[PDB]
Amino acid sequence: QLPGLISQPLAGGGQSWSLSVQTLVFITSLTFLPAILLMMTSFTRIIIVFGLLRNALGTPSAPPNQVLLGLALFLTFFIMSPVIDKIYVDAYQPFSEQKISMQEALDKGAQPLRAFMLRQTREADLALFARLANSGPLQGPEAVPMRILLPAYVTSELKTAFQIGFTIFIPFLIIDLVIASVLMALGMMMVPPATIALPFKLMLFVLVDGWQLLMGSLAQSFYS
Amino acid sequence: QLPGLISQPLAGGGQSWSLSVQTLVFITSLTFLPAILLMMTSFTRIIIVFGLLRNALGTPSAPPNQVLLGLALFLTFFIMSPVIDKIYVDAYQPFSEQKISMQEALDKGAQPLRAFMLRQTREADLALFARLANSGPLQGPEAVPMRILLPAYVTSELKTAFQIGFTIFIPFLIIDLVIASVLMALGMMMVPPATIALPFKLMLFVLVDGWQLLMGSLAQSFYS
Amino acid sequence: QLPGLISQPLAGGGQSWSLSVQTLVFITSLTFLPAILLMMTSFTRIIIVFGLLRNALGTPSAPPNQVLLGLALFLTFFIMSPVIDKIYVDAYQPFSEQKISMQEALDKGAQPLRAFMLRQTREADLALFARLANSGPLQGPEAVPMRILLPAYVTSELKTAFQIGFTIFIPFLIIDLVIASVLMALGMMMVPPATIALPFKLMLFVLVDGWQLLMGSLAQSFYS
Amino acid sequence: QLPGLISQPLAGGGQSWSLSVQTLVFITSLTFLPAILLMMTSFTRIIIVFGLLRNALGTPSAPPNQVLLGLALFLTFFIMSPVIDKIYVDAYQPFSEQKISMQEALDKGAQPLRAFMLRQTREADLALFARLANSGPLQGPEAVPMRILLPAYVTSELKTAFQIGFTIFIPFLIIDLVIASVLMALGMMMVPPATIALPFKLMLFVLVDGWQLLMGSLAQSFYS
Amino acid sequence: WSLSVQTLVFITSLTFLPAILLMMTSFTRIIIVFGLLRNALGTPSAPPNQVLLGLALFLTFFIMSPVIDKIYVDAYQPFSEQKISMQEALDKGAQPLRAFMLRQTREADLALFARLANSGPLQGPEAVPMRILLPAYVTSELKTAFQIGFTIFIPFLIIDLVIASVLMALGMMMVPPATIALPFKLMLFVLVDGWQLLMGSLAQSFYS
Amino acid sequence: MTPESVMMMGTEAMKVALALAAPLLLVALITGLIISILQAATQINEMTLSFIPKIVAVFIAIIVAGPWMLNLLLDYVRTLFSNLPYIIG
Amino acid sequence: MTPESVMMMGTEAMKVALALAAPLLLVALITGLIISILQAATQINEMTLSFIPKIVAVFIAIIVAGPWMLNLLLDYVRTLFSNLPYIIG
Amino acid sequence: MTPESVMMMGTEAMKVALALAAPLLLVALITGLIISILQAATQINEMTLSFIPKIVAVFIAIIVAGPWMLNLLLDYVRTLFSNLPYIIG
Amino acid sequence: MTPESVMMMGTEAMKVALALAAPLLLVALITGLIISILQAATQINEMTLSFIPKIVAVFIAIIVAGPWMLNLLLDYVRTLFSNLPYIIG
Amino acid sequence: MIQVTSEQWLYWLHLYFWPLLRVLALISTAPILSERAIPKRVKLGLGIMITLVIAPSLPANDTPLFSIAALWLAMQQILIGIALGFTMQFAFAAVRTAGEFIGLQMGLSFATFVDPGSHLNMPVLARIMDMLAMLLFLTFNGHLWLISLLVDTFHTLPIGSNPVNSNAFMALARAGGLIFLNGLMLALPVITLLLTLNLALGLLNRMAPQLSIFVIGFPLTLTVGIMLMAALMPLIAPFCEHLFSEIFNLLADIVSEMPINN
């Protein structure tokens, strides 16, 4: 009597030890659960910011993808520590001792996440997806289904990550333009400006201590 | 019910424990099953359009394949909430605790999918595959088989996805050509136009607020 | 049905657990049987042609490997409905209710596959492997063994797939060369021609109805 | 026949698994022997040569890994069919109906494999491993232990596969170098030579009838 | 009745056991060196993992043959016909393995695991239990396998760098150096018949 | 998806692109011509002498005719993304 | 799939590519040549002066010769995809 | 597989590659040098004026000496693949 | 396996890499300088004029200095394999 | 013969599971422990060898591994292992960044500058420097120190329901800035020398526009860069000693700071 296995007698004492349909869904989608879980968190914005920073430094794939995937994970774990804490003290703390029921526990585990997503989603995206869904007034946050909130959240995170990335490009774009113009004004047409500009970009990024500023901005602008 | 492990007595009280041929088929499908099940959904067109957009931005793999994978899944879940609910109430609910057999449980879960893919399939693809299969009139939805409906639907989705992607490349192509022309007219020949054009492309994409425009356009075009 | 584990009670509440050679060959063949079945189901030619098309588009992994793989299976399933249902009515139907043993069911279901692979295989490959095998007088098609039929069929499918891919490569190569020459003539010698050729490639591919023509060709050129 | 397991419950909710050493080594070997049997056969050279060819085509993973694995299996089955049927008539036939012992059937099933390896094993590898093992004269083929035959055979197969692959790369390297030099002469430092080389590589590989030649060479390289 | 499924789960779990025996053999070093070589050729998964695993198993069987013979004559043959107890035959099956481990195990790993195992002073090497010797041996094998792999891994990257520099100096910025370096790397590896030298070096350095 | 629709869409795109680049390219060309003419009087063989005035002229044109180009691009992209559901037939 | 047939397909493709790129390349060449001649006669020279007339000429040529080139490409690709099942072998 | 065999095979491969590339590179260099001499005699400072003549010359060279290079390369590959099961032992 | 041993191994590796690439790189540099000076003496000037001579010079250098570089590589690899057991601690 | 009853088979599975999971979390992301050359079977085997010593003298927090408690405990275990391993990834990321920045100035990967499309990077020099860093890591027994630090994490914070403090995670994410800083500090001499060489090439372009970067600069710049990297190697040894040591101190401080705020 395994949780995933269902047994039914057939014919002459034959028991069909078969796999439950829920277990089938899980075993089909196990390679997808990391994707959805990472999209419901702040991963979607940190990763785009990090990638756009890589492109801004004029040095694609300069830090390996794995180290930045780990770094973005740390920011998600720190940023949503209040969310998980709420989940712990509202869902697991009253349930670990079988003090409250299963059905309400998923709602209690989703309400902090629902509010957290709502605090980031633009009103325009929610209105657009509600109009496409032909839903009702949705005056209250509880009235907003996951069907509308999930795509609106990601389409807002993409926009804000792109905006932050563009703000990141702006200084490096100025650096590249200045270096190229200085080279061209001195009759150095053949010399590619990227080779000269790359060390200057890295030095200016390090001297202004840009990584600390990026962490501060990503931590600050996200909850507000 | 489901396919699983069977135990059949043999001879003098000897019991034989072995898997079922349907279980072997189930495992062999699992290797590619997720893909075939997900292409009957909206995943194909959305993921192709997103990949084409990522190539259009001049910055391949700036959003990683995992983020695009999660985003296509979220948009598909938003689009096919009614189909998923119909499958749930018609196939999943009456079969989770076995009020119905597996053979017609797939038929119940396929009829909404069949009708939907009929809605989203061009008549030209259906006629092409009917002629190739040398089938009959296929006047009714009941007449057209899955064998003809699946590849025609896939071809229609691929054609629509490339149409959308080609329309997407146009503003970014304009941006690239304009910036390259300006850089050449300034004598800035050795400067790579991609480095100067990526931040401008992102700035245009965030001022136009294209992300929600893309989601709305995809939803409206795919509901038709 | 399939070989598995056997159990005979012994003494007071004792369960023996043994297996035969069929079980140990079957468990090892589990890993390789999907590959062999894909080899005999012409998945190779379709997947290779589609990968070559993906390379010809100049945008690697614009449709992910999963969607390309799934559409290849869908096209093969459309192609081999007669083979599949012939196997069903000749092998799976008389074996599901254990009317025939597996040893004859395998060769009964492989007869339509044998006739198929004989139809698609070129005569040159068959002659080459017949003289490599140093066989005697081989006249009748039934006298052709599977050991000769399989690799010759694989070679014929590989050659046809490569020919089809080579022919597909031509218009995209023309577009790439034309745009590269135009860019060089205008002097924009730092602009990557791919970023301008990809939108034009997709414009051509959606204006010629590339998917319809490609699917129709892959179907019609196949029963021949 | 094969060894097994005995299980008797102990008190409430208990079970005991009695096991010998033969059954334990048999259970442990089940996850390894599918690879071992492919190491005694011609799989290594064929699969390595085909992977090297896949890299040579300039389009890695254009035929999926399962495609190469299945076609390599088919080629090995064609090559090893006499050994396979000799094993069948000498080992599997007299042991399927328990007419002869397992410890001696294993000896019978290895004699054709040992002869095959000695046919394809170079004397240099045998001398190297005999020196490393401080063995005796080993003048006769029967005097050669399996511990000497296996690694020497594997080393010879690896060396032969690498030789064949290196010979295969040369025409494709010539095509790539010529196309790159022509493009550089014309300018076009932005044009990737791969997009031109790949269609020309397919042109060559289908005009020279490359697949038949490669298969024939691989098959004839084993009888020698 | 669930006991008949518990035994099947036990068998499934037992299928994972041979990892322990491969740790006790040369597998952990040989497979790592061969994976490093696969990364060296610039063509990942050119020989499939099955091929690499099988050839590693064959090399280990060649290397570990005297140890297997000692175990056979000491543990398997008096226990196959039930002439000796299992609890003490298991001990008999480790002493050759003990002497085989202690030769290839570095002092630093043993010291670290003794410090973190809260074990007292030991008067003799035979007093070292398996629970502390096995992880130290595995770590030492990891270290030496990576050292061997990186020592062999140099000339291929030297070829890569040389070819990339030459192609770039020829103005061929869009030509990928890997596709030209792979045939040259294989040409060198065949010319210096590096398979034989690699096999011999692994065998001798693991014997010593 | 008729070829005439593709040609009309490409014509609109090319018109928008010309509207974008006409001021910048025109002012760059005019400034370059003026400096080339002035170089005849001075007999200066400083090859890239026209680069700085070209840059300042392009910057002036961008900071003067910038919002117009931005509005044109925003309107055109908005129309494209709005009629995306309609182009598919 | 004889080498003669491959050469025939290659020369057909080369003719299609030449007719596809002849207007743009010839117009760009003529514009560059005439602008360079004018610069030589005026004894003033800016290398990037000719880029704008070249771009304008190519832009005009694409408008004038666009439909014909597009029709050529569409017809040739349709012929290829129709003959594919007959040229497999 | 002795290093002498590798050297002779490599030199033969380089001979094939040179035969493939000698006409195209030669005609490209010749037409580029001729256009350069024209650029030097008459005070024409156009940069990409030689590109179109080089493309035309390479096109003509491929059209004329096409089947010869194709046959040479095919014969070389046939010989290599026929000697494959013999050069390895 | 002392850190100094790894450091010496890295220095030897880079020395071998330099000895492999110095001939070809220096030959390419020399021929590029020669072509550039010849162009400077005359009035001919384009980017691609020196590429073909650079290719030819590198090809000739590879032919001439091929066996020596191959012997260096083979000796280095053989010494590495021979000293592999000695470097293990 | 061999006898294995139910209690022993299960107790072993349940008792080892949580230290097993933490150790595998460390292994699957770690400087050398996480390499595709190492097969996953070896990855699990090393983890369970480490668990063989972790499990004794460790509190028995044996909860069912098919409940939500299992998910919560697994989350904390994976968090600890991932934190340790990815924090130690910083030294090798820094040396790879320095090597690739040196290579880009040399001109090895110029296709990346002109277009991001295509996998034409192949930072070979960065790979060589990463090898040297890993070999120095081996000679300094860095993996042993990682294992000891993991044991210390087991001791300080046991397997339990106490949430892990997130200020440490933010601090070690903020410490991610060491990559670029150490990349500069390792690559200042070659970067400055190649910048001066490129400026000299531009000055040569001044007198003759016919001199081009492709024609002249790239061969000479590549040769000079190869010579400099041959000369820069002896600087690597003390730099790696400092680099690993500072990261180890940072990890020790962060681990000591985690369990106060559960």
Author numbering:
A (entry chain E), B (entry chain D), C (entry chain C), D (entry chain B): 22 to 245
E (entry chain A): 38 to 245
F (entry chain J), G (entry chain I), H (entry chain H), I (entry chain G): 1 to 89
J (entry chain F): 1 to 262
Reported in the publication:
The FliPQR complex forms a channel for export of flagellar structural subunits. It also acts as a template for FliE assembly within the Membrane-supramembrane-ring. Five FliP subunits and one FliR subunit assemble into a right-handed helical structure with a narrow central pore. Four FliQ subunits peripherally associate on the outside of the FliP5–FliR1 complex.
To address this issue, we conducted cryoelectron microscopy (cryoEM) structural analysis of the purified Salmonella FliPQR complex reconstituted in a peptidisc, which is a sheet of short amphipathic bihelical peptides, and obtained the structure of the completely closed form at 3.0 Å resolution. After iterative 3D refinement with C1 symmetry, the 3D image of the FliPQR complex was reconstructed at 3.0 Å resolution from 109,333 particles (EMDB ID: EMD-61993). In agreement with previous reports, the FliPQR complex adopts a right-handed helical structure composed of 5 FliP subunits, 4 FliQ subunits, and 1 FliR subunit. The densities corresponding to residues 22 to 41 of four mature FliP subunits, FliP2, FliP3, FliP4, and FliP5, and residues 1 to 5 of FliR are clearly visible, enabling us to build the atomic model of these N-terminal regions. The N-terminal region of the four FliP subunits whose N termini are resolved forms a β-hairpin with β-strands β1 and β2. The N-terminal region of FliR contains a single β-strand (β1). These β-strands form a β-sheet at the tip of the FliPQR complex, which we named the β-cap. A total of six tryptophan residues, five Trp-38 of FliP and Trp-9 of FliR, stabilize the β-cap structure via hydrophobic contacts with each other. Furthermore, the N-terminal α-helix (α1) of FliP1 projects toward the export channel, and its N-terminal region, including Trp-38, inserts into the cavity of the β-cap, thereby maintaining the closed state of the periplasmic gate. The β-cap has a narrow pore between FliP5 and FliR that is wide enough to allow the passage of a single α-helix (Left).
